[PDB]
Amino acid sequence: SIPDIKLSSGHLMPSIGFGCWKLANATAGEQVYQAIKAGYRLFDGAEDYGNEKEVGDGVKRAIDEGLVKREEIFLTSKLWNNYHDPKNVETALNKTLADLKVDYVDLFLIHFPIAFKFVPIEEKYPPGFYCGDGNNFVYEDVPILETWKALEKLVAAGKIKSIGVSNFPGALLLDLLRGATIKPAVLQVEHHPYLQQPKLIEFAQKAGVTITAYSSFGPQSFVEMNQGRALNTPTLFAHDTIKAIAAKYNKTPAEVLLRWAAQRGIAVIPKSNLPERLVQNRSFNTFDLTKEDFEEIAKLDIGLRFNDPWDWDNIPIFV
Amino acid sequence: SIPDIKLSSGHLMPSIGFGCWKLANATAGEQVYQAIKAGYRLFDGAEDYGNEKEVGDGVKRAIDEGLVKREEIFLTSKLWNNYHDPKNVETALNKTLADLKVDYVDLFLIHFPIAFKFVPIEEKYPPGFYCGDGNNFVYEDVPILETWKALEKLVAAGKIKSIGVSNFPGALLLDLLRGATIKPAVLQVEHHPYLQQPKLIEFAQKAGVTITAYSSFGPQSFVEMNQGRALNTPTLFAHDTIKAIAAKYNKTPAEVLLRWAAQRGIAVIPKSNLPERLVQNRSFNTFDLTKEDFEEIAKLDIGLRFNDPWDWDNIPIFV
Numbered sequence: 001s002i003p004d005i006k007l008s009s010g011h012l013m014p015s016i017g018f019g020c021w022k023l024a025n026a027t028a029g030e031q032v033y034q035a036i037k038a039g040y041r042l043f044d045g046a047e048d049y050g051n052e053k054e055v056g057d058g059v060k061r062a063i064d065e066g067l068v069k070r071e072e073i074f075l076t077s078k079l080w081n082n083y084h085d086p087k088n089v090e091t092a093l094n095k096t097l098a099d100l101k102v103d104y105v106d107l108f109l110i111h112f113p114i115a116f117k118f119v120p121i122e123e124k125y126p127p128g129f130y131c132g133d134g135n136n137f138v139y140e141d142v143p144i145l146e147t148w149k150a151l152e153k154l155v156a157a158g159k160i161k162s163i164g165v166s167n168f169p170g171a172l173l174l175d176l177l178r179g180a181t182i183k184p185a186v187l188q189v190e191h192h193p194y195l196q197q198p199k200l201i202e203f204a205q206k207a208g209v210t211i212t213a214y215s216s217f218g219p220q221s222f223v224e225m226n227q228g229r230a231l232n233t234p235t236l237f238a239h240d241t242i243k244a245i246a247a248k249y250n251k252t253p254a255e256v257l258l259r260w261a262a263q264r265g266i267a268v269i270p271k272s273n274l275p276e277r278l279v280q281n282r283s284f285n286t287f288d289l290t291k292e293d294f295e296e297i298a299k300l301d302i303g304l305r306f307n308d309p310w311d312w313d314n315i316p317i318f319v
Numbered sequence: 320s321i322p323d324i325k326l327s328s329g330h331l332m333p334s335i336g337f338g339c340w341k342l343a344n345a346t347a348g349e350q351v352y353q354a355i356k357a358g359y360r361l362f363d364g365a366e367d368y369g370n371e372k373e374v375g376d377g378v379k380r381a382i383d384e385g386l387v388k389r390e391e392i393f394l395t396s397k398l399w400n401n402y403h404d405p406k407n408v409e410t411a412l413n414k415t416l417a418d419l420k421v422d423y424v425d426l427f428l429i430h431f432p433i434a435f436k437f438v439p440i441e442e443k444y445p446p447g448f449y450c451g452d453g454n455n456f457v458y459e460d461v462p463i464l465e466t467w468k469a470l471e472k473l474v475a476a477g478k479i480k481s482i483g484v485s486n487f488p489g490a491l492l493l494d495l496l497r498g499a500t501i502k503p504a505v506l507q508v509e510h511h512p513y514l515q516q517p518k519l520i521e522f523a524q525k526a527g528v529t530i531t532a533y534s535s536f537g538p539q540s541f542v543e544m545n546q547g548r549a550l551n552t553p554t555l556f557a558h559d560t561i562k563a564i565a566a567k568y569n570k571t572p573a574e575v576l577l578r579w580a581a582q583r584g585i586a587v588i589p590k591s592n593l594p595e596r597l598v599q600n601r602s603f604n605t606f607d608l609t610k611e612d613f614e615e616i617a618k619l620d621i622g623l624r625f626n627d628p629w630d631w632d633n634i635p636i637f638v
């Protein structure tokens with residue numbers, strides 16, 4: 001029932017997944033296990049989420065019970081910013097593999113086009129914004145392509161099935177395509193009605209790169225973290241445009257928000273943090289939006305970005 | 320006196336220059352020669368402008384009459400898109416040097432972070448958008464850093480004093496700084512009240528990169544090319560905000576537009592196509608805009624870009 005997308009790598013990737021950012025450690029394993037019982041097969045994780053061992057526990061439990069086999073589960077993880085230097089890339093992936101308790105991850109992404117100074121795993125893990133000097137940000141001179149080639153070698157070694165990037169703007173993705181032997185299979189970016197970036201989506205799709213949207217509910221994820229920008233932003237769940245379209249199809253605003261991406265061939269990985277949302281968030285493909293619906297939703301695009309490294313340390317990723 | 324800006328390379332660059340884009344071949348020499356007599360010392364040219372031989376004639380005449388010496392002139396040129404493959408960078412630079420009739424250029428910029436297929440000079444020069452296959456765009460898989468390293472060797476060879484880039488968004492500039500041995504001394508970008516990109520400016524200046532603005536009068540240069548977007552755009556010369564401020568100081572809108580950039584440490588290279596403009600375009604540093612003036616002008620920033628490769632072939636530089 002959940003459609004698969006064939007990546008440029010030749011592997012299939014479920015079009016609807018389960019988001020693991022801020023999935024609490026104490027309950028992450030139980031939540032992943034229940035997600036698997038509910039039919040989810042892709043888990044969007046990251047070294048920075050600091051809960052890969054627990055995500056690994058939930059998957060292992062489902063496998064041990066015979067609910068699924070490892071090859072039926074799609075695990076995505078992401079290389080954190082302190083690990084871009086080629087000599088530390090495999091080290092970080094090995095930590096991910098050991099925590100997830102698997103021999104390979106299905107998709108491994110460069111989390112951000114930012115290279116923090118390396119911090120040894122024994123000193124702090126996950127390091128977050130820590131760069132080895134108190135609260136100061138410290139960076140290292142590692143071009144993206146050096147990190148990409150280190151990843152390409154790890155695909156040849158069988159430790160990663162498909163590789164991609166997250167939080168890359170068009171000029172950067174284009175330059176990487178010039179040096180890549182294995183083309184990035186996935187571009188994972190913030191994508192919701194207030195930040196539609198239609199030209200980025202069009203370029204990447206035409207290049208054969210698959211888009212995975214994150215924060216499909218816009219400000220909501222950041223409101224939950226007390227972010228001022230998101231708290232100040234009218235919710236998409238109560239926006240008249242979204243509500244009118246939902247009422248027209250007798251669907252919920254959340255279903256409209258997910259379908260809007262899905263219908264355009266964009267993969268989604270919503271955070272389903274309540275049993276009812278688990279079902280709601282994988283059952284929305286029951287109606288089609290029309291060109292007019294897309295034109296009405298297109299009016300919400302105001303280029304409002306909630307996940308921005310400019311907020312961390314004025315890092316110019318999106319300027 | 321035109322203040323100088325000290326570049327990260329150690330060389331001084333006039334903060335006010337004479338733009339050579341669209342300077343007609345038949346009169347370019349005389350115009351450059353008159354600009355020199357009027358006090359201009361920096362000439363912003365490019366292979367794509369197709370008039371470097373004539374710009375060279377104007378500079379040579381002035382040197383031959385003893386008005387200036389080579390060392391007092393700052394010549395900027397730019398590497399066009401078809402010449403990014405390393406082996407073609409020196410040949411393209413040599414063509415520029417032979418046309419300008421000099422042994423070195425003071426500043427050489429990568430014109431766009433775009434790599435068109437190489438076209439021999441004898442086949443077509445300047446090639447513009449021609450890529451060797453009728454009207455089709457054809458590209459080369461040459462990462463920006465390879466091109467940059469080729470430029471660095473040319474600085475070592477004494478053929479270029481300072482190197483830089485043009486039309487680079489923040490993420491791409493940041494990645495280049497990670498691989499660059501000689502840091503880009505200049506970032507030249509479209510810059511006017513409708514496209515302020517304050518964060519990009521702030522990031523580059525803090526990184527020690529000097530900004531050169533082009534199209535300081537906004538839609539005007541593109542209106543002069545029958546461009547649809549520009550023709551349908553309220554001119555900055557009649558915009559109420561600019562008008563009010565020019566009136567307040569008994570300045571022309573053009574002088575306000577140039578000082579707005581200059582007062583913020585940004586170099587300007589206005590195309591002065593009339594004798595009176597020639598004088599005014601380098602004599603506008605006689606007043607300071609106030610914090611409120613800046614605040615008022617900041618309200619015009621709508622992100623309207625007139626020079627966008629997306630219009631050429633949906634090239635994702637700015638998305």
Ligand SMILES: NC(=O)c1ccc[n+]([C@@H]2O[C@H](COP(=O)([O-])OP(=O)(O)OC[C@H]3O[C@@H](n4cnc5c(N)ncnc54)[C@H](O)[C@@H]3O)[C@@H](O)[C@H]2O)c1
Pocket residue numbers: 018019020021022044045111166167188213214215216217218220221222224254269270271272273277280281307
């Ligand atoms: N690569 C990146 O930089 C990056 C950044 C952020 C998120 N992501 C990924 O994408 C995932 C999803 O994004 P997100 O976590 O920011 O949040 P989201 O937008 O999926 O959900 C945000 C919130 O909305 C609520 N919600 C979910 N389903 C709902 C429903 N049916 N009805 C009403 N409210 C509902 C929940 O409170 C939830 O926490 C993450 O868990 C992570 O895996 C990646």
Ligand SMILES: NC(=O)c1ccc[n+]([C@@H]2O[C@H](COP(=O)([O-])OP(=O)(O)OC[C@H]3O[C@@H](n4cnc5c(N)ncnc54)[C@H](O)[C@@H]3O)[C@@H](O)[C@H]2O)c1
Pocket residue numbers: 337338339340341363364430485486507532533534535536537539540541543571573574588589590591592596599600626
């Ligand atoms: N790197 C790049 O991609 C790039 C692109 C475009 C231009 N440039 C450079 O920057 C220069 C300046 O930019 P531009 O030529 O696009 O336009 P501009 O904004 O300097 O001037 C545009 C037009 O306004 C008029 N003008 C000039 N001075 C005036 C004055 N005092 N009062 C009233 N009108 C006046 C002229 O008709 C002129 O053609 C170019 O000549 C070129 O050297 C670089």
